[PDB]
Design a protein around this ligand. Structure first.
Ligand SMILES: *[C@@H]1O[C@H](CO)[C@@H](O)[C@H](O)[C@H]1NC(C)=O
Ligand SMILES: O=C1CC[C@@H]2Cc3ccccc3N12
Length: 358
């Protein structure tokens, strides 16, 4: 159980102006800190944000947040469920800014909603320093789905923040789960009334949120093209902090934005080739990502699932791969302790350890 703390700086808010916050479970005499970013899509204009406020309000507001949450998967404190970091200080940061953790805009006369995801992360880090983060040796910024993309957008800013605050000894690293998306062609193509492909949706989102992206990526793509930095394979090479990338080869959210709706009906040749080419393109974008875990499964998110230990690539689980990553970052590859684990087989569930969906 992680306990809720609403941000003392009440200028840093969820979409509706309620204070943002974080759930914390301390582990004294651990110098490891895990800050996890929740996911859950985004909204990018007044109408679809209003709709999200009606039926996904916990993703836009802290008014109804429970005072505790149970840590699961990598946020679990039992070794049985979390072989990797069970003894770490655990932080769960609710996603209530609907901006892929990129926003830096307050609710005001001109803005019905606040989009402060980038400032929320910075304020959580700042307020944690007085609760023991000042003594940290590693801060792993992790996240799933939109939170995984949020890791990529924010990990170097957390590193810069701690350096400017006087804590250059804290090693900041990133763990991006299910946030590595492709701006590929859709299987069936809509224009953009709502139908809005992620590239166009993000482009409008950045203007609506006052979204911010990592500085080196911003300098490459420049004014008007920042939406590019929301795509993992474009932003990752600009990053300096070590980042472990977890991505299903056949991610369900990727297939959704590709207008692929798998029906149980038989898969025709056109769709078969589309799905196989998606897996191949994902694999290709991970070729030069040394720390990665990419199983050939049709699924979405891994790291806060209670059975996240079950999936294996080439016989190595994700908790083991992350442990090997830890060893590789000690101050040359490790015998039998791999960190680059990308499936090569070409169809969902060709890996027998894939989640069953049960
Ligand atoms: C609260 O957060 C805002 C946004 O980051 C910042 O400008 C302001 O200085 C903060 N206030 C305090 C008292 O730290
Ligand atoms: O989070 C999510 C849900 C799936 C979409 C695709 C995408 C591209 C860039 C950033 C975020 C997201 N998506």
């Amino acid at each position: 159980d992680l306990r809720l703390h609403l941000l003392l700086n009440t200028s840093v808010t969820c979409n509706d102006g309620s204070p943002a916050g974080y759930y914390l479970k301390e582990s004294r005499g651990s110098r490891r800190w895990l800050l996890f970013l929740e996911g859950g899509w985004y909204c990018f204009n007044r109408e679809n944000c209003d709709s999200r406020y009606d039926t996904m309000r916990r993703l836009m507001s802290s008014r109804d947040w429970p005072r505790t949450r149970t840590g699961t998967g990598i946020l679990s404190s039992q070794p049985e469920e979390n072989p990797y970091w069970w003894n770490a200080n655990m932080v769960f940061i609710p996603y209530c800014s609907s901006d892929v953790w990129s926003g830096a805009s307050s609710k005001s006369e001109k803005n019905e909603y606040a989009f402060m995801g980038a400032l929320i992360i910075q304020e959580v880090v700042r307020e944690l320093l007085g609760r023991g983060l000042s003594g940290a040796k590693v801060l792993l910024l992790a996240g799933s789905s939109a939170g995984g993309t949020g890791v990529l957008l924010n990990v170097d800013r957390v590193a810069e923040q701690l350096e400017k605050l006087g804590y250059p000894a804290i090693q900041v690293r990133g763990l991006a789960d299910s946030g590595w998306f492709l701006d590929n062609k859709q299987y069936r193509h809509t224009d953009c009334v709502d139908t809005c492909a992620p590239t166009e949706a993000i482009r409008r989102g950045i203007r609506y949120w006052n979204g911010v992206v990592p500085e080196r990526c911003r300098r490459q793509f420049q004014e008007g093209e920042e939406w590019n930095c929301f795509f993992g394979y474009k932003v990752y090479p600009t990053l300096r902090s070590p980042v472990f990338v977890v991505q299903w080869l056949f991610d369900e959210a990727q297939l959704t934005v590709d207008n692929v709706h798998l029906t149980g009906q038989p898969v025709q040749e056109g769709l078969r080739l589309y799905i196989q080419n998606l897996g191949r393109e994902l694999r290709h974008t991970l070729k030069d990502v040394p720390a990665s875990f990419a199983p050939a499964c049709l699924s979405h998110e891994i790291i806060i699932r209670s059975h996240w230990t079950d999936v294996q690539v080439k016989g190595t689980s994700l908790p083991r791969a992350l442990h090997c990553w830890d060893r590789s970052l000690h101050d040359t590859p490790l015998k039998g302790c791999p960190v680059h684990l990308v499936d090569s087989c070409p169809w969902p569930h060709c890996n027998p350890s894939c989640p069953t969906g049960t």
